[PDB]
Amino acid sequence: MDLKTVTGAAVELSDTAFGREFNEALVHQVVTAYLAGGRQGTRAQKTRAEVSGGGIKPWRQKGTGRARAGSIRSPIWRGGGRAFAAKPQDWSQKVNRKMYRGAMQCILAELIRQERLILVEELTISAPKTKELIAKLSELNAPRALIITKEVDENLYLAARNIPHVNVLDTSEVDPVSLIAFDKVIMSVEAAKQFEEAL
Amino acid sequence: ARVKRGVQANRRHKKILKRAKGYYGARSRVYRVAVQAVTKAGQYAYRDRRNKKRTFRRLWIARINAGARLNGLSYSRFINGMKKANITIDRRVLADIAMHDAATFGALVEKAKAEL
Amino acid sequence: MYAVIKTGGKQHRVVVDELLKVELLKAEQGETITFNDVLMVVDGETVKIGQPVVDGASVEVEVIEHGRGEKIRIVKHNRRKHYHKEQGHRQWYTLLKIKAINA
Amino acid sequence: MEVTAKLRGAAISAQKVRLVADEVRGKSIERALDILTYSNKKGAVFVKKCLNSAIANAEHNHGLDIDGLKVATIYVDEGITLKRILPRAKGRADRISKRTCHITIKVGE
Amino acid sequence: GLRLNELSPGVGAKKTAQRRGRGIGSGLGKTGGRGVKGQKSRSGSSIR
RNA sequence: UGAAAUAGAACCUGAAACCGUGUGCGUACAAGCAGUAGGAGCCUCAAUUUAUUGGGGUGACUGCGUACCUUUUGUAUAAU
């Protein structure tokens, strides 16, 4: 509802997007589906057909006193194919549109509840300097945080591009994992309004 | 995510062989023979855990039978005498009295002998 | 100078300051338990046999500690029947110290 | 102390040298050498060679009186095996193991 | 959410899959619930 | 020489099968899935005022006891 930015100005955010509830089962599924979408799933193994050679019967079925065999590339043999060899596969799941929206509402609401959201009027850097933003985070009491602004600056990107546990994102490229991984979130008032409308 | 089972198999097989120490020949050396020796030992132990209670009562009764017959009657008449005198002493304690304190067992037989 | 007492479904021949372990009892460490239903008291030569209890005579013991016994492995196997079950067991016990045998 | 000599790689089976080793084990420096020099076994030339090297090691490296020495420990181990093929009748082949042995001798007061 | 550690599926949501032929204690050892020798116990069996 | 040389070139680590050497105990009048439940003796460590317990090794003697898997109505099976 009514939050206070760093300077002290009064900003009011909708409860439907910033004070909803914590649905852990809902948040877990959306977060874990995002992590499964990070996989590229590129691998394979050879089956019986795929391994080199092994087309002829190694010996006759009866008489030799050995276990019957049909190929030297059997999955029982050393160097043989893999029974159930792996192939490339897709790991991306479907999260329902309302499920993704609801999870982001739950995460942002929970971020406020544990005093991890920081509202600022604006966060701009005069020069593309890492030291300038490192100093601005210190006075903001967030040495490692996730900065969310509208129209991420072309020199604010360079300032944060070297700081270890610090990332600057557009509001339209914020993911559920980023809101949870980082210790704090510095959202501008303008960017908080975007989440108010988009959630 | 290939899983190599060598480490877990080694300590799994070692656990069975450690339990087979003192066995003769292959029963304490090779896992294939030791695993079914350890299982068979556990089966004997489970059955011998019932038979122990069964075997010590035979020992107590025989010791009591010797003690009662030394001075007076037999075991069959001794147990009847103790039952009629409302004496609850177990056969374990009786066999210990008979084998370790003959004066008390002599006095104990008399109480059973006067009751029949 | 010995008595026969009942504890935990079993019977025990006890003497003074003897460490005797019995089945688990609901008593604290150092608590004193008195057994006033002794089955037989033999003080040197005099024999007092209870029918089924010796009147007046009693034994006071103190609960030294409570603990588990040695671990028993319980193995069940049915040959040619695809059946095998194992479990462990540790029996609970109390350590008693016989203080005195009141006549 | 104990002065050790090793004869890793003796081209002979260990079973054939364990018989020779069992008669010099514990004997004095002198009795053991007479046993080895009048043995008919091939393993005795290998044991005597390793025993003599152990004596020189005690006399040279350790500065020890060889007159009071004794064969304190001796054991024959199995070495690396050379694997050969032996043709048999009807076109069958077996594996031949050409076993080698390691001879370790320790002399001491 | 709090953290990537304390994110739990909300008990009842997930169930462990069944693996056939992994020993006596698992309840599916040596046959996978297939029974004994028969057409429906074979590798390519179907109900048709 | 090297930190390391049972890191010495068959060289990192060095498991098991398998084969030796040493020590302790048992074993040459006794019949069998070789264990198990008892159990004397001996040997060895730690306490303890000094053989009294506790831990470890061995196992004389007694009772009971015909491997496992598979397949079967049914297997110690001389069925796989």
Distance measured from the CA of protein residue E18 to the C1' of nucleotide F80, in angstroms: 31
Give E-chain residues touching A32 at CB under 8 angstroms: 7
**H or E element that contains A137:** helix A130-139
Rounded CA separation A198/A192 (Å): 10
CA nearest to B23, candidates B31, B13, B34: B34
Q: How far is C84 from chain E (nearest CA, A)?
A: 7
A170 forms beta bridges with A149
Helix (H, G, I), strand (E, B) or coil at C43: strand
User: How many C-beta atoms lie closer than 10 Å to residue A104's C-beta?
Assistant: 21
CA nearest to E21, candidates B34, B31, B12, C82: C82
**Residue B48, Cα to own-chain centre: how many angstroms?**
8
Nucleotide closest to B37 measured between CA and C1': F35
A145 forms beta bridges with A184
The residues, any chain, with a CB within 8 Å of residue B64's CB and separated by 6 or more, are: B75, B78, B91, B94, B95, B98
Residue listed under structure tokens 């050393």: A78
Q: Which of residues 1-40 of E touch A (CB under 8 A)?
A: 1-4, 7-10, 13
Distance measured from the CA of protein residue B11 to the C1' of nucleotide F56, in angstroms: 24
Spell out the SS3 assignment of chain D. CEEEEECCCECCCHHHHHHHHHHHCCCEHHHHHHHHHCCCCCHHHHHHHHHHHHHHHHHHCCCCCHHHCEEEEEEEEECCCEEEEEECHHHCEEEEEECCEEEEEEEEC
A11 forms beta bridges with A3
On whether the CB atoms of residues B43 and C83 are closer than 8 A, the answer is no
Distance measured from the CA of protein residue A40 to the C1' of nucleotide F28, in angstroms: 75
* CB spacing of C84 vs E30 below 8 angstroms: no
On whether the CB atoms of residues A12 and A193 are closer than 8 A, the answer is no
- Amino acid present at B12: R
Compute the Cα dihedral for B16, B22, B27, B29 and give only its sign: positive
Give E-chain residues touching A27 at CB under 8 angstroms: 1, 7
* CB spacing of C84 vs E25 below 8 angstroms: yes
* Nucleotides, chain F, CB distance < 7 Å: 10, 15-22, 33-38, 57-59, 63-65, 67-72, 75-76
User: How many C-beta atoms lie closer than 10 Å to residue B61's C-beta?
Assistant: 15
* CB spacing of C84 vs E24 below 8 angstroms: yes
Rounded CA separation E2/E22 (Å): 38
**Residue C61, Cα to own-chain centre: how many angstroms?**
11
Distance measured from the CA of protein residue C79 to the C1' of nucleotide F35, in angstroms: 17
Q: Measured between CB atoms, does B87 come within 8 Å of chain C?
A: yes
Q: What is the CA radius of gyration of chain C?
A: 19
Residues lining strand F, beta carbon within 7 angstroms: B 10, 21-27, 29-30, 36-37, 39-41, 44-45, 47-49, 51-52, 55; C 77, 79-82; D 9, 14-15, 18, 22, 25, 73, 75-78, 80; E 30, 36-37
- Please give the residue of chain E at the shortest CA–CA distance from C86: E25
The residues, any chain, with a CB within 8 Å of residue C94's CB and separated by 6 or more, are: C21, C22, C23, C24, C25, C27, C63, C64, C65, C66
Instruction: Out of E4, E8, E10, name the one closest to residue A180 (CB).
Output: E4
Q: Which residues of C touch B (CB under 8 A)?
A: 4, 6, 10-13, 39-40, 42, 45, 47, 49-52, 72-77, 84, 86
Q: Measured between CB atoms, does E44 come within 8 Å of chain A?
A: no
Q: Measured between CB atoms, does B42 come within 8 Å of chain C?
A: yes
Give A-chain residues touching E2 at CB under 8 angstroms: 110, 114, 180
Nucleotide closest to B56 measured between CA and C1': F38
- Amino acid present at E18: Q
Experimentally, how was this structure solved? Answer: cryo-EM
The residues, any chain, with a CB within 8 Å of residue D18's CB and separated by 6 or more, are: D76
> Following DSSP, what letter does each residue of B63-108 receive, concatenated?
HHHHHHHHTS--HHHHHHHHHHTT----HHHHHHHHHH-HHHHHHH
Q: Which residues of A touch E (CB under 8 A)?
A: 22, 24-25, 27-29, 31-32, 106-107, 110, 114, 176-177, 179-181
Rounded CA separation A182/E2 (Å): 10
> Following DSSP, what letter does each residue of A44-110 receive, concatenated?
----TTTSSS--S-SS-SSSSSSPP-S-TT-TTSTT-PPTT-------PPPPPHHHHHHHHHHHHHH
Distance measured from the CA of protein residue C80 to the C1' of nucleotide F70, in angstroms: 8
Cα dihedral A135/A138/A144/A145 (nearest 10): -90
Compute the Cα dihedral for A121, A123, A127, A132 and give only its sign: positive
> Following DSSP, what letter does each residue of A158-187 receive, concatenated?
HHHSSSTT-EEEEGGG--HHHHHHSSEEEE
Length of chain D: 109
**H or E element that contains A117:** strand A117-120
* CB spacing of A25 vs E3 below 8 angstroms: no
Rounded CA separation D26/A184 (Å): 80
